[PDB]
Amino acid sequence: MSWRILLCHKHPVSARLRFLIPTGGGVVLPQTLPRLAVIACHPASALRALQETMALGWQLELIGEFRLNMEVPGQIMPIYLAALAGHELPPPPEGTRWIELTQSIGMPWLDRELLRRVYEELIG
Amino acid sequence: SQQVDKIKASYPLFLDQDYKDMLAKKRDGFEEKYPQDKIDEVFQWTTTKEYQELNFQREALTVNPAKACQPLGAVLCALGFEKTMPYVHGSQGCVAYFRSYFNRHFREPVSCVSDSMTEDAAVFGGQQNMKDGLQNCKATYKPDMIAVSTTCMAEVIGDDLNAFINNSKKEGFIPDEFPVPFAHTPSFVGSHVTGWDNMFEGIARYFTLKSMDDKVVGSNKKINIVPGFETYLGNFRVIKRMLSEMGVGYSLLSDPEEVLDTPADGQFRMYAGGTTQEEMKDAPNALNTVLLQPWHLEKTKKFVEGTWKHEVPKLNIPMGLDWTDEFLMKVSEISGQPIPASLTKERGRLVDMMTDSHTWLHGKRFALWGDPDFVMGLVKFLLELGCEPVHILCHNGNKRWKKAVDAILAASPYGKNATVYIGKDLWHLRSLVFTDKPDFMIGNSYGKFIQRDTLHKGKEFEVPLIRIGFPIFDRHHLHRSTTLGYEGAMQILTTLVNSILERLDEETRGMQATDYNHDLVR
Amino acid sequence: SQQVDKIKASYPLFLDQDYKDMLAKKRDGFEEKYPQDKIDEVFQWTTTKEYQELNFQREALTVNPAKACQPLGAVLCALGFEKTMPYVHGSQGCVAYFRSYFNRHFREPVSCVSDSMTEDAAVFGGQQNMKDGLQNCKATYKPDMIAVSTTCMAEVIGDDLNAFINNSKKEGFIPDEFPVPFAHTPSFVGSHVTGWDNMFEGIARYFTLKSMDDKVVGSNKKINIVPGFETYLGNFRVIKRMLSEMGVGYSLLSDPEEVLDTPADGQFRMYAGGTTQEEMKDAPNALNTVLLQPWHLEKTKKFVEGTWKHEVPKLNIPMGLDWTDEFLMKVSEISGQPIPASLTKERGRLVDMMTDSHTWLHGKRFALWGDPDFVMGLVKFLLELGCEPVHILCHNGNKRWKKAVDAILAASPYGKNATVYIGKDLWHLRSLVFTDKPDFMIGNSYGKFIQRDTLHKGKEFEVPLIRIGFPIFDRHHLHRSTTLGYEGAMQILTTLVNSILERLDEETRGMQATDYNHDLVR
Amino acid sequence: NKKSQPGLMTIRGCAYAGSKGVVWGPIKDMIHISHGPVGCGQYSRAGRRNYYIGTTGVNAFVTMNFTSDFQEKDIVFGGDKKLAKLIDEVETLFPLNKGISVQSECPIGLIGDDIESVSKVKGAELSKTIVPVRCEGFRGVSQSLGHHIANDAVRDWVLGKRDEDTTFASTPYDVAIIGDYNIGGDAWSSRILLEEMGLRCVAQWSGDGSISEIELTPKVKLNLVHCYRSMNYISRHMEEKYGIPWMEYNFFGPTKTIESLRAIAAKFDESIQKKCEEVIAKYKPEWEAVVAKYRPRLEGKRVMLYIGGLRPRHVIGAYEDLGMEVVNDDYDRLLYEEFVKRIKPDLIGSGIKEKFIFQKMGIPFREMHSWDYSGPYHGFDGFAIFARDMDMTLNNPCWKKLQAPWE
Amino acid sequence: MSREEVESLIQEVLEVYPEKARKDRNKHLAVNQSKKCIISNKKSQPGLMTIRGCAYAGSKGVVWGPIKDMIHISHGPVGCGQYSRAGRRNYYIGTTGVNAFVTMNFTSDFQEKDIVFGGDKKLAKLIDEVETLFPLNKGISVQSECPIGLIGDDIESVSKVKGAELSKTIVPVRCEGFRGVSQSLGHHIANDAVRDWVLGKRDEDTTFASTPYDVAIIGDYNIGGDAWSSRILLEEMGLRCVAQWSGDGSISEIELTPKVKLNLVHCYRSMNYISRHMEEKYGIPWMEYNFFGPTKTIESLRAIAAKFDESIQKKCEEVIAKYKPEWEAVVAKYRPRLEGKRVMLYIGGLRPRHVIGAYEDLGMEVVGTGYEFAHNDDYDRTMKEMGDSTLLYDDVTGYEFEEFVKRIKPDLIGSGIKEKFIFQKMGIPFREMHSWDYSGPYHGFDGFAIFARDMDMTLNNPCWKKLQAPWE
Ligand SMILES: [Fe+3]
């Protein structure tokens, strides 16, 4: 569609930033980013649509400060940040994994930069 | 239970019957502890020679090392310069551990900062971390200089200190003229003394490499003194006192004796004394450079001989009698100043103390450990005292140092039963003192556990510890002692002979059993 | 039986089975020893309060005194002058004992002569003995001045030192202008400190009494320092160092720190340093006279205030923090020289060491003994450290000194459980430390026999000894320590805190029993 | 729980410090390998005063430093073969160890080392519990991440070792002390009171803790958590999985100790409550005498504290019991010179590194991390020591001698 | 050293003395009947730094002090008892303060009042307090100091009265320091006190079971355990050492001494009077034994065994055979490092001539000796046991002895503590021949190993090779 969501979970005590990302590549939910995308609907509507399509029955909140906007051929696509509240990491759904930032080594520069910006927004 | 008139701390509060019964119930009900006979059998096995061969076959396991990492020595070197902040580019836990270590040893505030390198810097490097850390450090603590070292993570990910600092200066985070010397200090190479060497070489490079076209050797008629990794406040002062008595102009580079001995007058001083930047910039103009601890100041020696064009004398550490004499003669030859009568009288008094205490010091067996230069100086002094060093252990020593110490031992009749161990930790020394029992050990506080183990075998097998080295944690104000020069030699001799005398007094304090030898005059 | 590889001295050779059997046969066959149960019962009785009441009822018996006779202090005072020979008119055994005592304490050659008065002198006096002794002493050892004291025999038979010396000079045995000061030192009056006072007063009288017409107070812009009976070389050196730091001109009268620390260089020096005769002759020209130990320099104070017209300040011994401060301010006021920043930094460092070790020193209970001024200075320092001097004993103290120490104790919250004993010996202190156990006892080597006694009752009842005082015989080179000034305060603080830490480490070295508190960091 | 500003003199530890030094280190019967270079283990060797009972070097290894001592070749080529050889040598030289825990240092996670596979292989071969902990120092912003990672390792490797075991005789009065690290014997001073109440302390970890106690923890009836910050994860996991209720207890000062004892007894039958009242009556005169002796010399003095995660907010009760004034979930239950001058605090309580700074500034100080080489401070027996130390530090004359009389 | 050179040295060292001092000292320095060569046991020259002691030192510190079960009172001021407290290493076995009182100082602490009005009432009160506070003492000895004999104090009457009242043996020893010229008169006075108060306490008692192998060790003061090392060898020979005083000695052993069959006298100088008295009265033969060095020990053991039946001689041969390998190994190890070294000694009454045995056993040569308080008989015994063209000094002064050593320049010196530091400064290795330099024992086969080890430790110590600054 037109929106992208980076799904994260930060522990209130230990501040462990885990990222729920697809196992097939990419860093964004629900689908991967267009190949040519470079760094350049309501956000709550995007969050609820992602929750409905991915069968996420958890408490997901919108980090309104983290707004990014990339350009894909013929479209300016905002991407937002969705944080998972609570105290326990939920079991990852099918096709998704709960990676850490140091576990992003070997992934392309674009998604590593996206995760770095998320980490700076939340912990830094 | 507690009595308000005789309140007891953990010892001996936990020796009470109720606490003993509770601990026994805990052990017998849920700890699933091995039987006490089994524990005794295993301990007896660990004190045998078969366990010694099994322990000395170790090649991948290190138990109770006697060394630290390079950035600790780098921080110690950085602390010796005027208004200089040690800045360790890397994780903050390393800096916290360095500060805790130096606080426990010196019992003084220790200044050190980090850029808090985190997973983000693990993926992308610490360039932003370096910029922000340099800016915040300069804006907050107002240092005249920031001396940069590295932790293991920065060296592993490959952070270029030179490029990072240059980029920080170019983008306006710090002024272009602000002195920011740097040194790469990989914690997996060498030990803390190597870190001290790297930091000193980096600072000397930063201050002298690009301004050697107007430097003439002997212009200021002074002698540069590089003390190396030194944790005795008296060692910095004895060198200065002896050089001032000789009338010799000197420049003690990296002198931290002032910031580590700040007076308590209701005011906190982050910076106090230290080597000035002008002394470093004028260092190549000196007559010569004398390295107090040459066996870990190798990169410094190479830089001084190659760039400063100084004929660095081949001097051992000024520890003991002969080596202090050689150091004084070399200083006199370089400076042209005759050795004064005060130093001759001090040497005579030291020899007098040696003659007084030789009857008790002769023939004693010592197992000593520490840094290479300190260990070799202590071995030389023990040989001069008639003592027999039997277990010379140096975890951070090399083969050339071992060969030099073996040559020193072979030159004395008292080094016949001496073995030099390099790359061996304190668990090796435990087996060494269990199988070949010496009279005493000489080392840092980490040996206090070995004395606990030997006493477990029996009082006759106990090997008392003498705390000469780094770090000393279980005693107060021992960092103010001296080990260099005649004064340090007298202090060491007094400590050794008095420790022998306390051991003899304790062994002969049994009434009607061993008190016949409890002599008043000893 | 002996093994040539490991030769055993008396300990533990006499612990072998054959020697034990031989000693057991000797005891059980011919010694007629009391049964061991009887010995144990009597020893247990001696550690009770009833035995303490019996012990403190003593009126005529003295057991283990803590004092010496006057001529010993007279000899020590005489040794502090330039090329001066101590000459004790009386029996030679007294001189032999003085020399042996000082040789065992200082581990140095001590020069002292006697006229060897015998039974013949018991009926006719020692006039011929004095003449011959003076002539032989001047001809043989060539002293610049002979300082004459007396033994108990010469005092009992009533030998007039003045008349004897005048006849010796008149009859042609010594030159009429040769300096021969004299002092009557009755060994049955006072103690060694009284002898020091008498000898110093005699020397000062001899050199200044008949030449007071051309003396103006404050002409030479210097301050006279009278150290009293001092057996620490560091005490002599610290006063000179502190006065030189302030830039204050001083004259240390009776300075023996040079002849008692002569170097070993293949040459024996009978005389070294000391107060010159010109310094003593020019002493009345000083601004003021400061007595370092005023509580045994009362005769000297009377002479200085009466003859020299010096307003001697009412200063305590410069021991500890507050009294060192008072001494420094008084010296600054007298001389007009402000206290330098180096002394302020030294005071701040002492305060820092006080704060660093206050958690280990606060609340500790000490039983201390020694000379009056030393004891009161130690009590003041202990009160400044938060320690409790429960048992203060001074054999040679008087009622006025006891009142002063009680006034000092009542001014501090930590003197609540403190009692001052004067005229009591070390057996009284043994009873005190058995019935009211302190944590440590501070004193000379003679306390090593009390500690053993306590250890015989049990390890939980042992009172360790800290050797600070005179004489120290069972330790080497402790006479070079310092007890005066900030440096002496730091040395004493380090000794106390480290002794506490060794005691704690020893008490917690039991594996799986008390090693839970065997902390690496203390 | 955010990043620390670069270039500042922060005292925050690393994940390795929070995992090896805090959670895993106090376990006595297990051997903990500081996998990596030599510095981290050496600076952390015998640093924290987590007291224990055992024969060091034979069956207990708390104060020992086991490390891989990484060199350049171990960084270039990895340290997995070295780890396997080290595990073999540990088994050879220390046969009485009941487990091995490999605590990772910074280079381990950066050079791509699979310590989990080595741990699995060697544990299968030696039939030993080897726990790989990825406590690399760069991970996280403080020691809290170390606590979380160590708790995850406990849950995933040690906690479920007796899930299928039902040979343990359980009683209705079974409690487990979690988060008490026995700093100076605090855990012992709490366990004595708990057992005097009729409760059975089956597990007490990590302070004086053993692997058997950790395995037996899921078999208890109540979890008494001392430090919530470091063991909240494990307490919640045990509550969710084994259905074991957990509650927080505070034994600092007599009032807090009494309230916590009554609250704990309220979770059991009337016999435990009666025994708790009897214990409170027994210990009342002792702490009453302590207050009567030390409150007069401590009344009115003002306090500031700045400690890691738990002690900043739970030490107030003992201070008020002595008559002394004190001036995201942790904050829910000044909240960080001129300010210090304006309020004029009589005492500041923080760690060793700030201890000497505040000593230089002249304010009396108390080490709130290691009890200033004293203790215990918790429970009725520890309240006397705490009051004595308060009087010793606050009223020491050394703080009144900072200014030279001639200035 | 040529003899003419020794005479020239003596003349040169006496050149600086006054005429009276020179003429007196010329009779006390000789080159190896005593009267023809050396003059001994005479007055010491005033003001010449004498090493001699007093009669109190030779009586209390030497003969009476080592007795453990007895309490010895230093009657007089405090100094004499304070300086002699635990000065001598006369080892003993006992509970100090309960049944043994060797290292403890008992004194009356005379003040001006006691000097003016006497100290007899004070002495009686002191004896009462001693009996009250130390009930397990087996006897009291009152050692007089210098003031006692000058103020007209009658301690004999007090001793007799209090001993009769308390049924205790109180021995008054008038050992005033001014009496005599040295400690030899102290030895004589102490021996007279032992004979007159303690020795005859069991003359009418016949309840001791005696054996034909009864010997008593007299004059061995257990300096570092010498007496024990001699007694072990004596008892391994089959002899029963009934009495061993003063070292580790008891009053019961002193009383039992007249019941022995032989008196082995170690120190002839201090305990020759008592040995002669026992031989004349009780008919007990006495012989001198020397256990210093292996050769002397073997010769003395054979001579002692020759006084008994064949079984004792066979046991002596067995003991010598048993101890042969140990001292042979000691010699083999230490003689190479001690061969050819020259020694000089200045000791008190007995040791200067006794110690020459083990030095030769180790390959050393003695080139000079002397005494502090010896008599003519001691020098008569010494000249036979020393080499030719050597220097003998009687009551040598400080200056004389330093010049002597500066001229001979030996390799080792054995003397007291008062010259130890002087010779340490002059650069000559020194061994305390009085207290064994806080080592020992030195007597017997076990002591020979310690003696050789100490000789090698001191003579070959590196500290003597660092006395010259390398820039001078
Ligand atoms: Fe000396």
Residue numbers in the entry:
A (entry chain E): 1 to 40, 49 to 132
B (entry chain D), C (entry chain B): 2 to 523
D (entry chain C): 49 to 375, 384 to 389, 399 to 401, 410 to 480
E (entry chain A): 4 to 35, 41 to 480
Quote what the paper states about this structure.
Further data collection and classification of a subset of MoFeΔNifV particles resulted in a 2.71 Å overall resolution map with a protruding density that we hypothesized belonged to an endogenous binding partner pulled down with MoFeΔNifV during purification. A partial model built into this additional density was cross-referenced against Alpha Fold-predicted models of proteins identified in purified MoFeΔNifV samples by proteomic analysis. This approach revealed that the AlphaFold model of an uncharacterized protein of 15 kDa, a product of the Avin_01560 gene on the nif operon, matched the extended density. Building the model into this density yields the MoFeΔNifV-NafT complex. The binding site for this protein on MoFeΔNifV partially overlaps with that of the nitrogenase Fe-protein in the MoFe-protein:Fe-protein ADP-AlF4- stabilized complex and buries approximately ~1,400 Å2 surface area (PDB 1N2C38). At the interface between the two proteins, a well-ordered amphipathic helix from Trp ε117 to Ile ε131 packs against the MoFeΔNifV protein α- and β-subunits. Additionally, a loop in NafT spanning residues Lys ε10 to Leu ε17 extends into the MoFeΔNifV α-subunit. This extension allows for hydrogen bonding between Ser ε14 and Tyr α281, and a salt bridge between Arg ε16 and Asp α200. Perhaps more strikingly, this loop adds two histidines (His ε9 and His ε11) to a cluster of histidines that includes His ε95, His α195, and His α196, four of which are situated within 10 Å of each other. In the MoFeΔNifV-NafT state, the MoFeΔNifV shows asymmetric disordering of residues 1–48, 376–383, 390–398, and 402–409 in one of its α-subunits.
Nitrogenase catalyzes the ATP-dependent reduction of dinitrogen to ammonia during the process of biological nitrogen fixation that is essential for sustaining life. The Fe-protein mediates ATP-dependent electron transfer (ET) through its [4Fe:4S] cluster to the intermediate [8Fe:7S] P-cluster in the MoFe-protein; the electrons are subsequently shuttled to a [7Fe:1Mo:9S:1C]-R-homocitrate metallocluster, the FeMo-cofactor, within the active site of the MoFe-protein. The active site FeMo-cofactor contains a [7Fe:1Mo:9S:1C] metallocluster coordinated with an R-homocitrate (HCA) molecule.
